[model samples]
Structure formats: structure tokens, C-alpha cells
Target: SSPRLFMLSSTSSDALRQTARQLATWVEEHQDCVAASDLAYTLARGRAHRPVRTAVVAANLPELVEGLREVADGDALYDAAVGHGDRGPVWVFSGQGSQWAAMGTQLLASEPVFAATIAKLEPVIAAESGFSVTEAITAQQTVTGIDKVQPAVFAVQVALAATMEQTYGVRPGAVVGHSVGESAAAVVAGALSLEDAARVICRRSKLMTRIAGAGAMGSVELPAKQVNSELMARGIDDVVVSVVASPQSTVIGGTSDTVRDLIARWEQRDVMAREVAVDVAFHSPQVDPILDDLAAALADIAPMTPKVPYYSATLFDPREQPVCDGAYWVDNLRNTVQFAAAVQAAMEDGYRVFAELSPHPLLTHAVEQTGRSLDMSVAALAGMRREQPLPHGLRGLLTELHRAGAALDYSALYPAGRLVDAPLPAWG
Candidate 1:
């Protein structure tokens, strides 16, 4: 069922204008990397589902990592607005894997001004990443590990967003992330503080590593019917097909080697198969029990309620009012995410501007696919570079929208730090 309307907090009207423009600039600059089909991938394999079309936010490493950190601490959403009168949603978000290392650190050194924020996060990163945050700032190697990747990614994402905000006043229409990136998305959406999200992200990764040996996950090119038939025929139905990255793509997970063995069988039938890099089985029923432990930890942590109605990508549709707890997020580890619908839903509601804030372009594909479902008229991820300049094709389309009176207040999606409060829609 469509969740009841949420009463989201709205800040100064200026939030609408400032955020939209920033997003537009991003879309203008980076159009080459994202595709029209990326939307389906994000929904099938992500934590949060967002409908998007016309904004620009993330496309790098530093920007993606830290955003996740801020969300995990659960203070990412309801923090007060940092400033006033912005329309765009300046968000930080992440993707667990599928990105090459060293993706977006150039902005840190090139921008240099982001150094201070990196300095602030030093101690925590040093302890978690086994290297100095100081060095990681210059060389992000210490920060990029499966164990530390989420925080590292979230940190960089957060820092990048900070730079964009300071440099050009980039904000968001609605901040979102795919899969683990939702942690960052929450922070970008005024759902939590950077500190809280970082701390919790560290904790979540640690727990994930602890649970790694419980099950395994893999990929196969065979059709779902064939994949299921073989697995069931072997009496290993324990394996479940989690998120589907594309209609032709899907992931499998289950107890030890279940994913591996399934893939091996698939290869016999001319199916291209391989193991997911992380080797951690995700979104499978075997990992369902982890939900209780994660939920308990979440209750203890106390996530700050949103200051606004924010989108999510934990690989689940929050429209059902699913509990955003450790149990819920843990389940994400085992399920196949459905990201396309999330974006489609958001776009249907008038949020055409979409940003892929993760370190890589995995979620970006989901956007393109969703657009294809329509007649290609639905906008996908905006271009980061603009050929014509004015609104730059897809660049900052949302920002341009407000200039053309195409959208309502995005300030509702903006962070509420020192920003003036405004009237809000009610959620029940």
C-alpha cells in the first residue's frame, strides 16, 4: 500500500532555489557516466527506493562514503537547518560495492577547502580504518576497505557535498542513496547528523563482517526460472534470489557455498556466472535472523526522526512504513533490492531531479531503466557537464524547474539547521 502521507518539515523558501541550482550544475557536468536503465538496478538491489529525473548531487568517492556514516548514526534526518532559504536537497549517499577504488578523491585535493572537515573526522576513521585520516585525506587507501569502505565512502560523499554547498550553495530537491548509500542519503535529507551516521556505519560494517561466514552470495546469467529450478532440484532452496539489478540480472544468496554452487551449475548451461566481490551473502533468508540483533542495536541507538520527509534506498519500500531498524537494515544484507520503483514513485510525485550520490554509477543505471519503462520522456540522472549551459540539458533540471516554476518547495527536503521553519505537510 502507498504509505500514508508523511508530514515532512519544511525550512526557508530559499531552500527550493539554492538546492535546485546546485543539482542542476551537477547534472550538467556529469551526463556521460549515467544511463537511462540504472534506475531498475538501484530498486532491485538497494535499501531505499527513490523516483528521480532532474537533479545532480553525487558522482565521486569522498562525497559517497561519509554520507553513509552520517545516516547510520540515525541523527541524519532531523538536525536543524544549517542555513536558510534553499530549494534543492544537498544530500550525501553510498553504494556498498560495484565501484572501483580511488573513484572520487580528486575533489578533496583539488578543492583543499574540504580539508577541515576531514580533520574533524580523523580520530574515528583512524581507529576504524587502521590508518591515519590525515593520510587518507591525501591518499584514501587507508579509508577504502570492505570493512571501512562504507564510512570512507560516506565521509568523502559528505565532504564533497559540503564543498559543493560552500562553493556554489548546492542543495537537493530530495536527498537519496542506493543500498548502503541510504545511510548517507538520510543525512543529506535532514534525517541525521554526520557524527551519528558515521558512528553507526562503522558499527553496521563491523557487524556485517562478523556475520560474513553465516552465508554467501553470487550472480548468474541464467533465467530466474532455471536458476530456481536447479537450486530447488538440488534441495538447496534455502538460497533466495535477492535484488535484481536488471531484468537480465539477479543475485543469489544462502548458507555457505549455496550461492557459489548455484552459479557453478549456471555456468554449465552457458550462463555467465561469478561471485560478488564482497563474498558476503546478502538479502537471503539465511541472514534473516540477523535482523533481531540489528534491530536491538538500532533501538539502543535511537535514530532521530526526520526533520523532513526523506527518501530511502535500504533495498526496501518504506511506503509500507517498514521499521528502519537494525533488523530492517540487516535484512537488506540478504535481499535483492528493487531500486527502480523507488525512483519511479518519487518521479510520479513530481521529484524529477535525481542524483546518484554513491561512489560509482551502479544506481545510476536504475534511473535509465525506469525512464525506458516510460516513453523515454521521463528524465534520468542529469548530466554533470552542460553543452548549452542554461539548465544544461539535464543538469540541475530541478533547479531550472523552480526558475521556470515547475516544482514546489525543496526546502522541505533540505537540512534544517539554522534555517527558518515553514509550514509542512502532515503524515499519519
Candidate 2:
């Protein structure tokens, strides 16, 4: 019962009703109760998720059997229609505002793949930053500046992507990253090697710390064009639109005083506006001071064509696949993030499902908003959340993705068990 069993079946409602009866009869006839692990493994290996889907999580065979019975009676524990699309889910990595204290520690303890990935990345990250990423994640050491947080976030994003691929077989059809998160996406897409990505992230964030406390960022519910119009109307020339997140979501950045004043003004008008938890004003003119230095430091690194489709929030043109060289990284720093454009482009290209590969759900809403504007329904999934149990959160994500028609390989999720001879269902 320590490791709970998750089982899913895809079939017609009538077929599921018949399956419930058949399974109940078969289990009753067997003198030796089937091992829950064996049943879970059997179902995972044998079943292919179809349109009509139902999932059950249980500690033992009796619980599973009961759940199925409920399912047949139209009171299923979990039942939904799978919206399977032509392509697999796109993995979107958020830059900042997704990191939190002790974010990946639980996954480090529970998921072997996740733990191993972190271990593999620890040395590469430490070599560049002179700080242990593992320690910072586990809260053993305090992270003080942009340098520490950015690398730690990158490490976690990369580790989560690896775990999703290696353990769950959830490979992305396409990948995108916001600002600093692009470094991690580049690594996953095979456009940048681990060593090179580590070096870039370390240098980029280290330089960002120099501008920290000089500028600030804030999120507003207004559209980018409207936000710009309002800024111009108020003669707020210092602040500029930093991120066009969606049709109705934008982030503005400028000097601390200017940003705070804008936020206060919007608050007074009952507009949803709040300060972002970042000292450096990314994607703003404030980052121009360090771009030359950043580009020079990263000049020696090599970049490759991405093995996976890499949609860039910085270079959002559908025809332009960025080389991600030093100049590209500099542009990523100082340019307004075209997140909405990237998502729209990806959606237009037939990517219907999106999974946010970060510690928290920061950009899923933005993605959903983009889809809504296009009159398209999309499945936006979150990897994990703050203060959530790792196993439960991961299972929930997998279950949602499964319901969303993601082609998940369930065999890897189950333990080994001998197959038991069971009766065939009447429908089949």
C-alpha cells in the first residue's frame, strides 16, 4: 500500500459496464487474490487509452474492483472523454516567478529519475556558479542573489524535463521557454550542451545581479497595447511593456519607483496589477547595461540546431529559429518577451496540449488565454506546485495529461508482476 496503484481504461461506457461485471466475476472465482501490483501492471501494459476514459487510484485489488463497479454504475471515481490530438504536448518552461523555497526537494527524495538528473546537473552548475544547486534546492544553503536563484531554477527545470522523458516517456512535440528558462529549454532540445548552458546561465544571472535593486517588474491584467497606450497617456516613458504574456496579460518593467507608481495607479482604478518578485527588470531597457558583457562572456559557447521543435518567446517569428548564440542571448535579455506570439504560433502549428515544466503553474493561464483568443480549446498542464506532495501532484498531472489524450507509456509506472490468466470481456 506504500506505492499506490493507478489504473486507466479507455472504452465505450457500455463496454466498461460489461468489463466491471467480468472483472468482478473473475476475481471472485480465483482462490488466491491477485496481487494489486500484478493487476495494475497487467492493465497498464495491455490497455491503450481511447476516447472514453476512466482512471482509478487504489491501494489494493478490492478497492480497484469497487471503483470499477462504481464506474459501471455511472458513479465513476474519474471519468472523462480524451481529447487526443494529432501531436503530442508542448513543454513550456517559465523563467522566473515559478521558483520557491524547497521546491524540488520532495521530487529529489521520491523520484529516482528526478534525483539522478539533479545529481548529474549539480557539478555542472556548481562549476559555473561556485554554489551547490542541490543545497539551495534542499534549503541547506540560502540563495542570496539573482545568480543563485536563476541557476537553481534552470537546474530544476532541466531535471523535471529529464524525469518526464526518462521515467514517464512524456516527450514533447515542441518546446518553449520564457527568458532565463530558454537556457534550460535549449539543453532539452539539444541546441545547447549541459556544460555550455550551465556556463551561460551562470554568467547571465551573475551579471543580472548587478542590475538588481535598480529596477522592478509588475504584472497587469490589461492587454499589452492598452498598457502601452495608458503608459504613453500618463507620460510614463520610463516604464515599458516587458512581456506580452497573452491577449489580456502583460508585464511592465522600469525603475523601481516608476513601476511601483504604475502598480499603485492601476490598483486605485481597481485593475489587477501587482509587483513581480524580482529585483532585476528583465526584458526591459534596464538590462541593456549588461548585454555587451553577457555576450562577450558567452561568445565561446557553441549552439546547435534543436533536435526538437524549439519555439522561442524572444525570437517569436514562426519562420525564425534562433541559433541561441551570444547575440541571441543578449537579445533575449533586452527585448520584450513575445510569449503570446510564440504560443499562438505553436497552436497554429497543431500543438493543442501544453505542459508547464516548472516548480509552479506560472504560464498555464497565459497559454490558456492565448488559446481562448484563438477560439481553440487547449490542455495546459502544470508540472508541480508549491507545498504539494510530489507523488500526488505528479500523478495528478499524469492523469490530467492522459485524459487530455497525451500518449503516456504506463508500463514504466508499474512494478513487475507475473501475469495471471483472466477471463476475456464479453464485448471484446
Candidate 3:
């Protein structure tokens, strides 16, 4: 019916090249899940652009087919996609003991979305601390100190979360953070502005670094109740439970001697206890010396209602999510990390998808363990895996989310140029 088609054609070679490129883009996007017939039918019977139609004209069919093959080779895209059930995603930021050297360096180079976020945050962080966050992450001179590590971890977590949202349109149904991780989560939930979170975290990291080597922390395979009871039974006043990770896993912190003594005692009772690789005793009474200073420094940040639902790991309660205030934040640092209780509460409240926003996942296993014990359909995933190359791991994460039926903005991940539909094949 068209003048260009069967009624004496005058199509040029330029039109064909454009059509081949457009077809190539589609094949690349679908990866290995397509067949030749599918492509053929889509192109032949489908309404196509004038150039695309000309590309497959009988005179140039050989060249067009050859070019298309390069675009859509039959290579399978593989990842850990199976068994992750269809459910909404919940973002959980990790605390300390998860940082590693050069954790986000590759991601900073490979992911535009992630890199852009860091680019925006680096200046703010530098203005407060007078150190370049970018250089700290990418250079050979690592920022291994607690002061630099905490905020760096915060920046990485926030940037990774932003990338996930941008790439997949996968927003969290609920958000939670562990200890220093809470600072990142607060910003994600809109309870704290970015600069406010950055400033407060910078202050905190500096303070915690100053107190480093003054206390210690250890993990014990005992219930919080049992550990508390045992500490009381032994009249041990120095050691206290810092985090209740699960029904049988708790972290105790205090003076190094007291922590060691507690671990030895627990082992004697056939309980497994090990020292956590951390210099500062977080979420313990050891934080008492810095409270007035912390409060005075942060008393002006009026907490606001979160744009998204927030679960407090400090006070894990299914019945209530606290309205954050200056006082609440004070307790956030000073109280036990009720991570187990908070995760359990989230599961009971019908959350099944949990994603750890960290350089390397340190809590996905714990989240999965809790969910398995409760006999619920849960999928706990980490944004990045330790020691794996960034691009490969990111693709795996994206595939896993896709398998779980999360809606993804795939175009955002791999941008393709403007494509026009090629002309379809005529009636055979």
C-alpha cells in the first residue's frame, strides 16, 4: 500500500544500516532468551521503519542477516535468580564489621548512577571532614580508621541503594539500618536530610575513632535472655549485650578483659563465642562518656516523620515504629541493637524481600536465618558480594531481582540509542 514498498522501490543503503543497528540493540537487551524465528517474525510481519525494511530487501538480505547475528548471539545470561520468591523489596543497611579495602572502587568506575551519587556526596563529606571520600575509596592509601570507615560505608550504602532504585525502579517497602547503618537509612526514609545525616555521621565517626581501643566486642551463640541472665548470675558488671542478632546469637561488649572473660565462660558452658573484629565497642555503656557531647552536637536536628515506613533496630517492636527525635537518636547509639527482634517483626508484618545495602553483605545470612526459622517465604539478597568484580556482581543482583518479579527499568542500566522499527517482510 505504501509508495516505497512493492510499487517500484528506491531505498538507499543508509536506511538498511540504521535498521540493522536497531535490531542489534533489541537482541543485546534480551540476551540469550530469544530464537531466530522470534526475531524473524518480529521483523518480517511487524510494522518496521523504512530503513529497516530496506535492510532486508532480497538484494541485501545476506548482509542484514549477518549483521543481526552479531547483535543477538545465543549466549545465556546466568545468575542466582531462582528460588527468590515474588515479593516487595525491603532495604536493610549494614553497620560496621562489613567494610573492606577498596570495596566501592570498581562500582564507582562502572556504574554511572552510583558514581554520580558519590560525586554529589564527596564534596559534602570533604567539607565536614577535610578529606576526599573519592580518594579514600579509589586510591592505594586506604582510609582504614574508624572515623573514615563509618562515613565511607554510609556513602557506599546510600549510593548503592540509589543505583538499585534508578536501575530497577525497586523502591523499598520498608527500611531499617544496623547501628551506623541507621544514619544512611534515615536519609533514605526522608527522616533526615542528606547533609544532616552526613554531618551527624561525620561527628560520630570522629568521636568513635577517638575512643577506639578503649573497649571491645564479641559474638556469643546464646539468647539475649540467657546472656543477660548469665551475666547477672556471675555478678559481671562490666560486660553487656550490645546486639541481639537472633534467638541464639548475641554480641557482648565492654572492657577487653571483661569481654574475654565472658567469652571464656560462655565456651566453658558449651556455648560458641568469638571476638568480633571491631576496635570500638558500639551500642554499649562504653558510649556513655560521649553522650552529652553527641547530644549537644546534634540537639538541633528536629526529627521528622519518614516518607517511608522505618523499622528501628534499636527498639525492635512490631506494634510500633518510633517517631524519631533527638532523644531517640541518642538511644539509637546507646542502646542494644535489637536486630533479631526488628527483622522478626518485619517478617511477621508480611515483609519477605530483604536487600542488604552494603559493599559486601554481612547480614543477608542472618536475615535469611531468621526468616527460615519463622517458616516464611523470604528472599534476602546483598547488593554486592565480597571480592567479586563489580560489574559481574551487579548483573547478578539485577537478574536475581528480575527473577523475583520486581519491575525493572532495564533501559536505565544499558542505555540504547533511539531506535526505529524496521519494515516487515511481505506476504510469502
Model 3 lDDT, residue 296, Cα = 76
Q: What C-alpha lDDT do the candidate models reach, one value each?
A: 0.49, 0.80, 0.69
lDDT of 3 by residue, 33-127 (tens): 54433344343233322311222212133333445553234332222222232345678898876776777788887777788888988988898
How many steric clashes between backbone atoms does each model show? 123, 0, 6
Choose 1 or 2, whichever is better by lDDT: 2
Q: Write model 1 residue lDDT over 1-428, tens digit each, in one string.
A: 11111111223233323333333344344435433123112211221111221122333423322332222233222222222222353232536663433443454445543555666666776665455544543453434455566666666666655554554345565665556776666665555566656666766776676666767667665545666677677787678776554345556777666677777777887888877665556666655655666656566544566654455545456343333456556655545565545565565555544555544445455565555555344333321221123221122433433322223333323322231122222321
Candidate 2 RMSD to the real structure: 3.0
TM-score of each predicted structure versus truth: 0.59, 0.89, 0.76
Residue runs of model 3 more than 4 Å from their true location after superposition: 1-87, 268-270, 316-319, 405-428
Residue 323 lDDT (model 1) = 39
lDDT score, candidate 2, position 222:
94
Model 2 misplacement above 4 A: 1-4, 10-38, 69-86, 140-142, 392-395, 414-428
Predicted model with the maximum TM-score: 2
Find the 10 residues in a row with the least total lDDT in model 3.
1-10
Candidate 1 minimal-lDDT segment of 10 residues: 1-10
Candidate rank order under TM-score: 2, 3, 1
